[PDB]
């Protein structure tokens, strides 16, 4: 029927957080190693991924209650979900006209052939694009896109997490917010929330295929030396 004060505040800082960690002009991309079209795009794309990981953390540090989880749970959540939040947040640069991420002119317009030259096979990129297409096609609001990312970050079923009772509770409070938001403030879409939860299941499958290609890549020194320290730490198997 209505949104509560606590729930309006959960929405406000989530939207603000995303605004503090997402630049719709992509003006920092000039500071990355330049794109080159055997894996000539890996330097740039590792730098892009490493940048975004930093972004995903600053966002995560502002999700209500994340800060209060023990350090090991904050780490466990960010380690398993980071790539999924990157796929989710990447949707803002994806374009249906060109079927690509358009972060700039010809340099920063990333297509499937490009991400191939960063070491990823069709078996991951073919679902990723279809996920991007269907996610764009839901025409989410700022408030829903940002709830979706926080709901993804707070999944209790990640390897490593220890206090899955409390993480469960934080994620259900956000699912309450999203469901209330969609009903009160989203004219259409009675089935939209069920569709958004489906998108989470898709990202789990994306997460698994990525992990395999990344494990294979990270284990090859000629390629792992083109990665960044942060990428190797967040996507790597340490504890």
């Amino acid at each position: 029927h209505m949104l509560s004060d606590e729930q309006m505040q959960i929405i406000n800082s989530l939207v603000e957080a995303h605004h503090k960690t997402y630049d719709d002009s992509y003006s920092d991309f000039v500071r990355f190693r330049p794109p080159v079209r055997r894996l000539s795009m890996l330097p740039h794309l590792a730098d892009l991924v490493s940048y975004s990981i930093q972004k995903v953390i600053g966002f995560a540090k502002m999700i209500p209650g994340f800060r209060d989880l023990t350090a090991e749970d904050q780490i466990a959540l960010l380690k398993s979900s980071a790539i999924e939040i990157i796929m989710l947040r990447s949707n803002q640069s994806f374009s249906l006209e060109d079927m690509s991420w358009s972060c700039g002119g010809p340099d920063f317009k990333y297509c499937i052939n490009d991400v191939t030259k960063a070491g990823h096979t069709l078996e991951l990129l073919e679902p990723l694009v279809k996920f991007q297409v269907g996610l764009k096609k839901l025409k989410l609001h700022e408030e829903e896109h940002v709830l979706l990312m926080a709901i993804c970050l707070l999944s209790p079923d990640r390897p490593g997490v220890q206090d899955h009772v409390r993480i469960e509770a934080l994620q259900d409070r956000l699912c309450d917010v999203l469901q209330a938001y969609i009903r009160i403030q989203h004219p259409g879409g009675r089935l939209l929330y069920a569709k958004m939860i489906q998108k989470l299941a898709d990202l789990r499958s994306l997460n698994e295929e990525h992990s395999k290609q990344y494990r294979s890549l990270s284990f090859q020194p000629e390629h792992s030396m083109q990665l960044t320290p942060l990428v190797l730490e967040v996507f790597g198997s340490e504890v």
Partner: peptide, 10 residues
Amino acid sequence: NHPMLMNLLK
């Protein structure tokens, strides 16, 4: 441990 992840988390 995770020195870089730790540092980014204030």
